[PDB]
Design a protein around this ligand. Structure first.
Ligand SMILES: *[C@@H]1O[C@H](CO)[C@@H](O)[C@H](O)[C@H]1NC(C)=O
Ligand SMILES: *[C@@H]1O[C@H](CO)[C@@H](O)[C@H](O)[C@H]1NC(C)=O
Ligand SMILES: *[C@@H]1O[C@H](CO)[C@@H](O)[C@H](O)[C@H]1NC(C)=O
Ligand SMILES: *[C@@H]1O[C@H](CO)[C@@H](O)[C@H](O)[C@H]1NC(C)=O
Ligand SMILES: *[C@@H]1O[C@H](CO)[C@@H](O)[C@H](O)[C@H]1NC(C)=O
Ligand SMILES: *[C@@H]1O[C@H](CO)[C@@H](O)[C@H](O)[C@H]1NC(C)=O
Lengths: 486, 486, 484
């Protein structure tokens, strides 16, 4: 005969490379980036409740150093701690520092309950030139520096507090470390001193350390802070013959501990986001991010890859003939379509049903990549100033392992998605072609290039009947059969 | 040019929604749940060896507290520790309690070897009103409370035990802390006392802490317990001038520790199962469970999902015409089938080569799926009464991380399986169609809807020859061609 | 119409079983093992830097014990610690030994920087019979044992070292624990002694514990060792009235610690490899290994599986509705088998074969792509039980190995099912490519053979195989033989 109908698919001048199981660069018409690499320049104060430490890290917040008054009564989902935090009080350290920091941050509030402690015969409310408050010598406002009396006495202290409330209590207490033996006896009479804090099932006892040390805020002495949790029904004893930095009460512990801490210089802005990193919040719908392993809230999974491209279109093939060799750059209002050549000339029209089928499957894939919120809050430290050994080895190894596994998952996921997407769109093309083959029945012959040679005169109107499925092959059959075989 | 034979597949009234990579809800004929949500109200005492602590926790078992005698000589894969266990002996604490408990649990037995310690001049076998056995004062039966002689003497003790055997020895010993100086001298004469326990490479020196503890069951005196492991070829030394709570021997350590502990109130039953949780045993062949992260033995992976349905059958399309886009609800003795209409009438017959090819490919998925061990005994603690800091944060993070990784694995796997199953069953339908097409050769024409218009006369005789593959096309070729093209 | 043309695929006498999502046993033509099970009987000294401790473990190397001098100035990616290392000096303990060992190992070098400490009036360079060099009393050569002068004098020592360099400093110092009070006053005059070491950001003090320990190398006394890190800008104060075992300088810390330690008896050889285990180096391109969970460098992932076979060819069918495969076909994967008047024959199609070959090579190189290098990890074997921290360390590693073993199983199954589907798809594509070359001049026998309904000599048979055969020329002849 001579009128020809072709089936084919769209194509663009320049597409995007994606990966599959079998190769790392297959060009497809459209693609979607799955790794978020952009963050906001600020931290969003909504909807998570953020509290800014400003000059106070969370530990001198609990101790009550000068400049930390704004944190009294505070409640947070995320405590924002500044790397710029400045010391304003007595030089201290904290054995197992990170555990106290963790407990304070996880707890999520500063609610202090003043208690009267009947210390006997010793001086109270010791103050320091290294801890000026409102330009006067002062001290941590949650702590009480006991010293020997003017009569030169420091008798054994032995105070019990019973937890008969309905919440667990957190006591913070310290041990003072003088610079010389002379200082030890000048302050506490007894040498050595001893600080002992006991519950029903535990006991921390500390012998003070004596010796000259580097000047810190003018001083060679130090305080080491410790803490004790007291469950309801439990008791705590404070027992000393010297060097106790006494609590003035206790912090309330929440039963549910759901909060956390983020150490970052990034300012708090006005945006809205439930995902925070140390580099700023993230506002995205992508499932992965390469911005930071440190993240909090409703977040994308951290991976090592800078880019993972999800195919959102069929394979892109460059350019009458059908789909067996090429794609059609001219087809721009559909994914698949008909190209014809008859007496009245040529033309191209899109096929809606096959185009809509391929699009629905791709959107389906996209929606499935929207995971339900898997909100994470208190996790583990992921950056460290200096080496510590065993426990830090374990922490870095855990995070390193986790990241490798998720990066693998991401990599395999997009390869599998893309392989299927390509097969799905290849399959929609062949089904379109099969549909028409069966429409034409014995009236036409498969040319092999995705085109049917039709063996009867075919109108522009006869073409239209083929494309909308009203073509009745019986009408043309007699004529067609003997155009074909004779 | 009149008979029609159609190929199709079964369909049911109400299928089951499953998931693929592309779809959140696609309907299949049958499906299998992969997440176990049901557990037994009991713990199964076989094939794992369970020991019921009953009234004693495992640490009290090791010390030999009153009420713990049933544990003498016990061996276990899993020690069942009851939440209702109470302290019945002398008030004690254990500095690294969690680790002592873990070591005892992991070791898997209470095999005590008595040793005679030739203590000099001190009284042995001290007993107490705080540790009654049958309303008579007693003590931990693995421990030996040394006190001063009637002659008011507590001479230096210096006793050595060399390990010349072939296993490592666990020694448990304690230090007693009196309430007052008077109690100290009444018991041990010397004040202060000291206890020093050494091996070749290690030394533990404890100075008692007098009068710094709150009351427990009316006593503010307390014992602190320690442990020492002695490798073969090594030795242990006990050196004390007071307050030593001496061991009566040592426990044997198993160099291949593979036991653990489970804290639960769930009674031991008479079921059979290799998987235990704090909620009770699980008896299933499903590969996943959402019951508890605390599981021991040969267990299904714990996941977050409440349900993951695995398709065990083709797509369900409920409701003269073959398979192209609906299915036959009256096909019940096969998965795929022939439906015909000729002069003699109508009929449906199942094809079984096709039906079995599909079932065999599905069945294999299930056996691959429900396959190999997951043999895990001693793990880590996974629930916590109260925050502790760094190490517990790391323990929680490791577990939470593991669960997300397994939940992802479960989610993906079921989607991959279901996508494959759906392609497999679709493929089988089309292989069946192609088989018949190539049987008929030029005697029939593809009607486009999964049917063949047969252009010769065809009774029930030749219908079955089509269905059993004996149909000779050449017999009717002349008749059939004549009807096709005239 | 009776010449017949057929399309099929290669087969072999016997090939290899593989696994997919559905079956644990599907025979394919060729396959590749993805799990390395063989190691070298030695450790490769290239291209990573290995340093052999010999008789010296790393902690003694840091202290400068006899037999560790060869470690002076050493730099490593992997410190090789021998299980037969023994103590050769004063008996000592290190509180948190494992952390010191780990820091020394991770740091990756023994770059010691000597300093003059102007100790006042005390005697220096004390030696012991328990620490013999040649055959003379000696000592840890990084340490300086201070004792009272000849005039019974040990004045308070108070020495400062300021860090005005651009690297963190590691100081290792010690506290001596005498066996008796008489030994204490004999050595240090004062009783008790006191050792206090402090920076701006950390402080400690150690009161010596006087008492007898079990005899070791003729002594009941002990030294306990400590370390202190001093950052740039910080400084350190050594303050003492007795029992200090003084540093003679400090070690330099790299800002970028990239090294680790391997404890193994395996000898260092002459081979080349970038993956090391406790059982020897591994030289392989395979992505997985079942040799050891302890591995360092550029290594395959450790998995529990002994074997994971990846299909590198199509299903192997002996001797669908293609027959099975052709064993006669051995210069391609897919080909043509015909029979006309002048005889039979078989030829291989290039593209279909090459297309399948290319897609399979693609998998292989995506698989064997394989970078990221891991050095310092965690300890994975333990001599005695410890409780909590060791429990977590073992649990982490167990979890990791399970997850990766699962990944390996899933991956191979997915690749195999795809490799099979692709190679069957390429067969069927070759078929209906030919179908459209014949048009109306041939029919589908239903077994992959086209009944050519016209006289088809060797040279129309080739014409089909080069894409030239014109279906017009024989159309009338064909139709006449088909319907007549
Ligand atoms: C994330 O990836 C982008 C490009 O994909 C890259 O430019 C950026 O450096 C990456 N971010 C990090 C923190 O590596
Ligand atoms: C204790 O026994 C050990 C080993 O027999 C011995 O070396 C030491 O001198 C003894 N101590 C006393 C005080 O007798
Ligand atoms: C300290 O108080 C406890 C009870 O609160 C008491 O048992 C103990 O004896 C007291 N300490 C002294 C040295 O008396
Ligand atoms: C487990 O899943 C079932 C549904 O299959 C749900 O009803 C149940 O609440 C889940 N259990 C837990 C502990 O979440
Ligand atoms: C001890 O050394 C410190 C640190 O340099 C110094 O500040 C202090 O004054 C010294 N004390 C003396 C020399 O008595
Ligand atoms: C590794 O797998 C091989 C099988 O290829 C097996 O023979 C060998 O025992 C395995 N190695 C180990 C250490 O289990």
């Amino acid at each position: 005969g001579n009128p020809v109908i072709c089936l084919g698919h769209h194509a663009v001048s320049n597409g995007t490379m994606v990966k599959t199981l079998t190769d790392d660069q297959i060009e497809v018409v459209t693609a979607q980036e799955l790794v978020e690499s952009q963050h906001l320049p600020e931290l969003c104060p909504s909807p998570l409740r953020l509290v800014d430490g400003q000059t106070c890290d969370i530990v001198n917040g609990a101790l009550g150093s000068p400049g930390c008054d704004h944190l009294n009564g505070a409640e947070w989902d995320v405590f924002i701690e500044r790397p710029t935090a400045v010391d304003t009080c007595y030089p201290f350290d904290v054995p197992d520092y990170q555990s106290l920091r963790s407990i304070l941050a996880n707890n999520g509030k500063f609610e202090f309950i003043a208690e009267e402690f009947q210390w006997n015969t010793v001086k109270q409310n010791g103050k320091s030139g290294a801890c000026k408050r409102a330009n006067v010598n002062d001290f941590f406002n949650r702590l009480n520096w006991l010293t020997k009396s003017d009569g030169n006495a420091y008798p054994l202290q032995n105070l019990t507090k019973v937890n008969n409330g309905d919440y667990a209590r957190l006591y913070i207490w310290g041990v003072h470390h003088p610079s010389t033996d002379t200082e030890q006896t000048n302050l506490y009479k007894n040498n050595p001193g001893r600080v002992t804090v006991s519950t029903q099932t535990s006991q921390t006892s500390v012998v003070p350390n004596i010796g000259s040390r580097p000047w810190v805020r003018g001083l060679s002495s130090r305080i080491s802070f410790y803490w004790t949790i007291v469950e309801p029904g439990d008791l705590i004893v404070f027992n000393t013959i010297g060097n106790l930095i006494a609590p003035r009460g206790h912090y309330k512990l929440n039963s549910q501990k759901k909060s956390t801490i983020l150490n970052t210089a990034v300012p708090i802005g006005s945006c809205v986001s439930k995902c925070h990193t140390d580099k700023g919040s993230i506002s995205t719908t992508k499932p992965f991010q390469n911005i930071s392993r440190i993240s909090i809230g409703d977040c994308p999974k951290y991976v090592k890859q800078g880019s993972l491209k999800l195919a959102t279109g069929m394979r892109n093939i460059p350019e009458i003939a059908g789909f067996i060799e090429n794609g059609w750059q001219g087809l721009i209002d559909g994914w698949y379509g008909f190209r014809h050549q008859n007496a009245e000339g040529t033309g191209t029209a899109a096929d809606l049903k096959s185009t809509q089928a391929a699009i629905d499957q791709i959107n389906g894939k996209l929606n499935r990549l929207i995971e339900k919120p898997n909100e994470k809050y208190h996790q583990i430290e992921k950056e460290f100033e200096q080496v510590e050994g065993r426990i830090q080895d374990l922490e870095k190894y855990v995070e390193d392992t986790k990241i490798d596994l998720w990066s693998y998952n991401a990599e395999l996921l997009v390869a599998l998605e893309n392989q299927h997407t390509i097969d799905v769109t290849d399959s929609e093309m062949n089904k379109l072609f099969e549909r028409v083959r069966h429409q034409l029945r014995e009236n036409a012959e498969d040319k092999g290039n995705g085109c049917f040679e039709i063996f009867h005169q075919c109108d522009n109107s006869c073409i239209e009947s083929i494309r909308n499925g009203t073509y009745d092959h019986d009408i043309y059959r007699d004529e067609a059969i003997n155009n074909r075989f004779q």
